Every structure is written in C-alpha cells, then in structure tokens.
Design an enzyme around this catalytic site. Structure first.
Site, PDB file in Angstrom:
ATOM      1  CG  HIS A  41     -20.070 -62.735 -33.888  1.00 25.55           C
ATOM      2  ND1 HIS A  41     -18.866 -62.550 -34.541  1.00 25.55           N
ATOM      3  CD2 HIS A  41     -19.938 -63.889 -33.178  1.00 25.55           C
ATOM      4  CE1 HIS A  41     -18.016 -63.500 -34.176  1.00 25.55           C
ATOM      5  NE2 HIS A  41     -18.649 -64.342 -33.369  1.00 25.55           N
ATOM      6  CG  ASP A  86     -18.125 -59.774 -36.379  1.00 23.87           C
ATOM      7  OD1 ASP A  86     -18.770 -59.291 -35.426  1.00 23.87           O
ATOM      8  OD2 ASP A  86     -17.879 -60.982 -36.501  1.00 23.87           O
ATOM      9  CB  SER A 182     -15.751 -65.930 -33.040  1.00 25.89           C
ATOM     10  OG  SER A 182     -16.797 -65.818 -32.088  1.00 25.89           O
ATOM     11  N   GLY A 183     -13.742 -63.654 -31.919  1.00 24.88           N
ATOM     12  CA  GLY A 183     -13.461 -62.435 -31.144  1.00 24.88           C
ATOM     13  C   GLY A 183     -12.005 -62.384 -30.673  1.00 24.88           C
TER      14      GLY A 183
END
Length: 231
Positions: A41, A86, A182-183
């Site tokens: 994402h 994801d 995130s990530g």
C-alpha cells in the site's frame, strides 16, 4: 509511533525510509544487499519520485540514498477495503556493503510461526500524535502478538484477519504505530528475528477496537526468495 521511545542511533541498521521528494512515506526492511521489503500500500505512488534512504537515525540527515530499479508488489495484493497480501519488494539501484549503520536483516525460516503472546517490537518515523507530524528521529514500540481469533471478534476486526496477519497490542491504550510507520519490520523474540511487515495504520492510530496488524513474513519467504533470486 505514538508513545514510543527514541532508539539508540543505528541500533536497527536494517531500517529503510521510503521517501517521495525527500518526504518520508513509509518504513521498510533491508532483507538483501539489493532489496527492501515494505507494504504494498506504500506504492500507491508516482514511482519515479520515490527513493529509499538507508542508515538513518535523524530524518533530516542525508543517510545513504538509492533510486528504485524495480517495485514488485505481491502478485495477489488487494488494496483497501479488502487489504490482503500487503507486501512489496523494492530493488535498490545499487548494492549495500554491510557496515555498522546499514546491514540486512535475515529472513525467517519459511516454517516460522508467530504465536500469540510473543514479545516483539517495531520501529519507525511515523506520526507521534494523532494529526501530528512525523518523528524527527527513529523510535520504537514494544508489541505483543494477540490471538487472531480474539482479534477477529465482531467488536474488533470482525472476521477480517486471515492466518497470514499478525494482530498486535502495545502495553497501554495510548501507544500505537501511526501514519508513516507502515511497511516497517516487526521483530520478535530475544533474537529480534524478522517476523512481519506492518500493514496499513488505522486512521485513528490508537483506535482500541482495531489492534495494529502486520503481515507475517514466513508465509511469503518462498516468494521473496524467487524474486530476489536467492534460494
């Protein structure tokens, strides 16, 4: 991260910052001298203007910057409102020689299980308050793995978490990963072993009924190996 602690500088040398025009967007983990793993994402973006920055503690510091040769989203990635698979692999336009400040983090065994009650941490430069600003410095937060079935309760994720997700809890209601985190990697155990990649942060970061979630890395190890060409 809200309610986190600044890390000892360069204590997590596998950390990447994915940036657009010098602005941090997402975290990432260096898993090969040529490859960063992050969330899929994170790549809803104009790819040309993206860079990967390694060896950072302070965000307004140069670190070591790479252009991206290739951005390989998981073949079965589905976005929000049906977020699944994801994960994305970004190939650096160079090759990291490991040093004190930049070093890959080993993939887990493909048989690795991330059991409920496991003690983990994450790190990132994401927001330090709701509606706030990115952290100027890399921060960390302790997280324990929750039971997926309990996380799937109708008042929480309402059956939406699959066996590939890791549901997580901080030690208090007011600590959480937040926009920009995130990530980044989830590392678990005494061995600080790579266990997951943080998925999308809840818009309201400390939402008590949406425990943060990370994609387990182990179920994706064969795909990561096929993409990086390292068996």
């Amino acid at each position: 991260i809200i309610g986190g602690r600044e890390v000892i500088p360069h204590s997590r040398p596998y950390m990447a910052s994915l940036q657009r025009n010098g602005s941090h967007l997402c975290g990432g983990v260096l898993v090969h001298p040529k490859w960063v793993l992050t969330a899929a994402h994170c790549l809803a973006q104009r790819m040309a203007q993206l860079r990967l920055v390694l060896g950072l503690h302070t965000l307004d510091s140069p670190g070591l910057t790479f252009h991206i040769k290739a951005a390989i989203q998981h073949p079965r990635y589905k976005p929000v409102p049906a977020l699944e698979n994801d994960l994305a692999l970004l190939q650096l336009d160079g090759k990291v020689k490991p040093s004190r400040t930049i070093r890959p983090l080993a993939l887990p065994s493909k048989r690795q299980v991330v059991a409920a009650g496991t003690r983990c941490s994450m790190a990132g430069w994401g927001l330090t308050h709701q509606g706030g600003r990115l952290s100027r410095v890399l921060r960390e937060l302790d997280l324990q793995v929750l039971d997926t079935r309990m996380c799937n309760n109708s008042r929480f994720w309402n059956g939406s978490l699959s066996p590939s997700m890791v549901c997580l809890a901080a030690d208090s209601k007011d600590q959480a990963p937040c926009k920009g985190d995130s990530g980044g990697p989830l590392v678990c155990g005494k061995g600080r072993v790579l266990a997951g990649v943080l998925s999308f942060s809840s818009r309201v970061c400390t939402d008590i009924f949406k425990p943060p979630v990370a994609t387990a890395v182990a179920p994706y190890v064969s795909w990561i190996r096929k993409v990086t060409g390292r068996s």
